[PDB]
């Protein structure tokens, strides 16, 4: 159907045209006339090429202009908050103020109250609901994007709890990938179900093996080696997105391709890639990317920094980069389709042994094949090396996607959520906690939740014994200072426990390595991994600082190669964080501690929230003497700077490097910066014209 036919506020229709939309894809039409316009709940399960977002926006903005209030959009990761934030900007033109919310769990973020569209992660929104922000009752609609992640172990439970809290309290719209149980998820959400197999460009799915690609129609096409599929894509001026399981593999396979891909390029093309590779700050990770890019092939994974990944996604979408070998982790960032999508690996490293890539994911990767403007047909090829080609075809192509199961049974999120229900949503009887649970997706799918009730009761004993809660003088559960505080910090009740137990020791010896090692051993941070060749050196580093650690034993749980692992992962991480606050250059940190940019960025951001929560836990326990020290450690962790550089950090575009260049040149305070001519600041190596402009602009 056409835009204008949409019986919605005229201002929406206008924006859709100013964009470029005149008509809707069948799935969209079906969804837009499902009843979501009437404020009804709906589960839209259609391929991502089909425009799920647009449906949500129209629905959101509509609900908001016709009934006032706020529309909450839930994205999977912080990095995807920005993309959504940008593509939602045009709604400001019609009066709707848009905002992002992804961190700072320990805050009501009341400032958000003055906004009409809030883009937050499930975690951020969970925290906000815990803090009971006054603008929450204002929300008329919440869109759960990538809602199939509800069946995801690591974070699915959180997405479910926020949903269970919201059902019947606001409109709920789910945007998901094809699954095995849409009807079930829909009925739980008491929602209209929109299932469509429709997509913009035709998709051709095939399985490559021993030198041949068999498609779903039984036909065949010769290709010497799988990589011939790529060289073939480029010789036809098309793109190739190769999916791999490991970071090093992504890099190797990219370098290898590029060697042969350059010869299929042009003199102008080579030049564009050259200037491109010539625009990257030197590094062990950037060396590999550049050398590879100079051949039209780039790799993409979580180990690269935001700049570098954004640069690959963009120059790929722009056809400059001819191919991209990426890990499916931060994959989504590549909102960049491709003529041919090759799934190189179908067996990933499980957290137990070996497992095939879930069908749902294989479809999401394949469905990412075929660019609208350039292709009339996209080709998704699954490579089989061990498996039977006929079997691979049966599992993925002809077989339906796996069914989604609630992951509420996650002790981690469940411990955190049982305490929240008491510490922030006012639950005081076990009979009440099961009433909530009876309305969850877990209880929907199940005939009984008896096993869950048991977990919950044991969770209560853990919270009860660990002073997180108490059974009042009326035979009722009521939170304690430590409990509210913990639920509000959004840290896992278990990591808070770790903080309380070790508190005495931190008070006694408040040191960087000890604190960094402590938090790096918590369920709220994913430490740095290490290779066998880093162990030896790590062991020495360890003994050298054993006296400073609070958790001084790598084996209090056993000899499991995995326990000694977790502990040294935490220790290496603490050394990295030490060099970080110690102002060691990023290219140097990456080199010495054998770690990657994207990881440093992530660990640093999390460590800060953890050093902060450690400070807030110390407060609810009386350890007031380490509170100032911890706050100064928090601010140092946040920027990777020494104590004196702290006042300069409020300056725009001023990080570790520039703050030091300014301080070492005499400008130690904001007052020092103010009483200065631009000529002076520009003489300092590292402060360019754009920085001085932002700085003086900041100073009035």
> Which residues here bind ligand ACP, judged by CB under 6 A?
21, 24-25, 28, 48, 50-54, 145, 175, 335
Query: Shortest distance, CB of residue 76 to ligand ACP, whole angstroms?
Result: 9
Closer by beta carbon to ligand ACP, 52 or else 165: 52
Residue with nearest beta carbon to ligand ACP: 51
Does the annotation list 51 as a binding residue?
Answer: yes
- At its nearest, how many Å lie between ligand ACP and the CB of residue 20? 6
**Long-range contacts of the stretch 631-640 (C-beta < 8 A, 24+):** 633/512, 633/515, 633/581, 634/608, 636/581, 637/577, 637/580, 637/581, 637/604, 637/607, 637/608, 637/611, 638/604, 638/608, 640/580, 640/581, 640/583, 640/604
Q: Is residue 662 within a helix (H) or strand (E), and if so which, with residue range?
A: helix 656-663
Residue 145 in tokens:
């994007």
Which residue's CB is nearer to ligand ACP, number 15 or number 28?
Answer: 28
| Minimum distance, C-beta of residue 335 to ligand ACP, in the bound complex (Å) | 5
Q: Is 40 annotated as a binding residue?
A: no
Query: Is 306 within 8 Å of 598 (Cβ atoms)?
Result: yes
Q: How far apart are CA 95 and CA 92, in angstroms?
A: 5
Shortest gap between Cβ of 478 and ligand ACP (angstroms)?
41
Dihedral, 237, 47, 306, 111 alpha carbons, nearest 10: 140
What is the C-alpha to C-alpha distance for residues 663 and 654, in angstroms, rounded to an integer? 11
Is 47 labelled as part of a ligand binding site?
yes
- Are the C-beta atoms of residues 74 and 162 closer than 8 Å to each other? yes
> Token pair of 403, please?
């069914």
Nearer to ligand ACP, 175 or 681 (CB): 175
Is 647 marked as binding a ligand? no
594 is in an annotated binding site: no
State residue 362 phi and psi, 5-degree precision: -65, -40
Q: Is 33 annotated as a binding residue?
A: no
Burial 601-639 (b: 16+ CB within 10 A, else e): ebbbebbbbbbbbbbbbbebbebeebeeebeebbbbbbb
Residue (374 or 436) nearer to ligand ACP, CB: 374
Least CB distance from residue 50 to ligand ACP, whole Å?
6
Q: Which is nearer to ligand ACP, 144 or 297 (CB)?
A: 144
Residue number with CB closer to ligand ACP (331 or 412) = 331
Using the minimum distance from each CB to ligand ACP, give the nearer residue, 71 or 175: 175
User: Are 556 and 533 contacting, i.e. CB atoms less than 8 angstroms apart?
Assistant: no
3-class secondary structure for 53-116? HHHHHHHHHHHHHHHCCEEEEEECCCHHHHHHHHHHHHHCCCCCCEEEECCCCCCCCHHHHHCC
Q: Give the total residue count for the chain.
A: 700
Give whichever of 371 and 497 is closer to ligand ACP, judged by the CB atom. 371
Minimum distance from residue 92 beta carbon to ligand ACP (Å): 18
The CB-of-53 to ligand ACP minimum distance in angstroms stands at 4
Annotated binding residue 171: no
- CB of residue 341 vs ligand ACP: minimum separation in angstroms? 14
User: Can you tell me the distance from the alpha carbon of 185 to that of 174, in angstroms, rounded to the nearest whole number?
Assistant: 9
384 is in an annotated binding site: no
Count CB neighbours of 69 within 10 A: 16
Query: Is residue 23 marked as binding?
Result: yes
**Residue 102 annotated as binding site:** no
Q: Residues comprising the binding site?
A: 23, 28, 46-53
Q: Residues comprising the binding site for ATP?
A: 23, 28, 46-53
């Amino acid at each position: 159907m056409r835009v204008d036919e949409l019986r919605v506020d005229e201002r929406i229709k206008s924006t859709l045209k100013e964009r470029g939309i005149e008509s809707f894809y069948p799935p969209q039409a079906e969804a837009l006339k499902s009843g979501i316009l009437e404020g009804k709940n709906a589960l839209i399960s259609i391929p991502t090429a089909s425009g799920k977002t647009l449906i949500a926006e129209i629905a959101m903005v509509h609900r908001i202009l016709t009934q006032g209030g706020k529309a909450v959009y839930i994205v999977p990761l912080k990095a995807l908050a920005e993309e959504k934030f940008q593509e939602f900007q045009d709604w400001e033109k019609i009066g709707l103020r848009v905002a992002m919310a992804t961190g700072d769990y320990d805050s009501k973020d009341e400032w958000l109250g003055k906004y009409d569209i809030i883009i937050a992660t499930a975690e951020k929104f969970d925290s906000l609901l815990r803090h009971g922000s006054s603008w929450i009752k204002d929300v008329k609609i919440l869109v759960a994007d990538e809602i199939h992640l509800i069946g995801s172990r690591d974070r699915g439970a959180t997405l479910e709890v926020i949903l269970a809290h919201m059902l019947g309290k606001a409109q709920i719209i789910g945007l998901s990938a094809t699954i095995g149980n849409p009807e079930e998820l829909a009925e739980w959400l008491n929602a209209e179900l929109i299932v469509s197999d429709w997509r913009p460009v035709k998709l051709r799915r095939g399985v490559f093996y021993q030198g041949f690609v068999t498609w779903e129609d039984g036909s065949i096409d010769r290709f010497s080696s799988w990589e011939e599929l790529v060289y073939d894509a480029i010789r036809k001026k098309k793109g190739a997105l190769i999916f791999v399981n490991m970071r090093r593999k992504a890099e190797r396979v990219a370098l290898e391709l590029s060697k042969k891909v350059k010869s299929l390029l042009t003199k102008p093309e080579i030049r564009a890639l050259n200037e491109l590779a010539d625009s990257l700050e030197e590094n062990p990770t950037n060396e590999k990317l550049a050398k590879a890019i100079r051949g039209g092939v780039a790799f993409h994974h979580a180990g690269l920094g935001r700049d570098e990944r954004v640069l690959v996604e963009e120059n790929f979408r722009k056809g400059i980069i001819k191919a991209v070998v990426a890990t499916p982790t931060l994959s989504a960032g590549i909102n960049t389709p491709a003529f041919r999508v090759i799934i190189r690996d179908i067996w990933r490293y499980s957290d137990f042994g070996m497992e095939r890539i879930p069908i749902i994911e294989v479809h999401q990767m394949l469905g990412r094949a075929g660019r609208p403007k350039y292709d009339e047909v996209g080709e998704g090829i699954i490579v089989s090396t061990s498996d039977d080609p006929r079997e691979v075809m049966n599992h993925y192509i002809f077989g339906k996607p796996e069914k989604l199961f609630s992951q509420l049974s996650n002790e981690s999120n469940l411990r955190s959520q049982v305490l929240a229900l008491i510490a922030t949503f006012g639950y005081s009887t076990v009979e009440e906690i099961l009433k909530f649970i009876s309305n969850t997706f877990y209880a929907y799918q199940r005939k009984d939740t008896y096993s869950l009730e048991e977990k919950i009761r044991n969770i209560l004993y853990f919270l009860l014994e660990n002073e997180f809660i108490e059974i009042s003088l009326e035979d009722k559960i009521r939170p304690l200072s430590l409990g509210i505080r913990t639920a509000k910090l959004y840290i896992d009740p278990y990591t808070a426990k770790m903080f309380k137990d070790k508190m005495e020791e931190v008070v006694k010896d408040p040191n960087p390595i000890g604190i960094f090692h402590l938090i790096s051993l918590t369920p709220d941070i994913t430490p740095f991994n290490y290779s066998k060749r880093e162990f030896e050196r790590l062991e020495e580093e360890y003994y050298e600082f054993k006296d400073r650690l609070y958790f001084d034993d790598p084996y209090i749980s056993g000899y499991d190669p995995y326990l000694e692992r977790k502990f040294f992962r935490a220790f290496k991480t603490a050394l990295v964080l030490l060099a970080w606050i110690n102002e060691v250059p990023e290219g140097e940190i990456v080199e010495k501690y054998s770690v990657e940019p994207g990881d440093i960025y992530r660990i640093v951001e999390t460590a800060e929230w953890l050093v902060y929560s450690l400070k807030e836990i110390a407060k609810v326990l009386g350890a007031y003497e380490i509170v100032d020290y911890l706050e100064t450690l928090r601010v140092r962790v946040k920027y990777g700077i020494r104590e004196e550089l702290i006042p300069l950090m409020q300056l725009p575009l001023v990080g570790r490097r520039r703050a030091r260049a300014l301080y070492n040149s005499g400008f130690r305070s904001i007052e020092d910066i103010s009483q200065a001519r631009p000529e002076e600041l520009l003489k300092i190596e590292g402060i360019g014209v754009k920085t001085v402009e932002a700085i003086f602009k900041f100073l009035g």
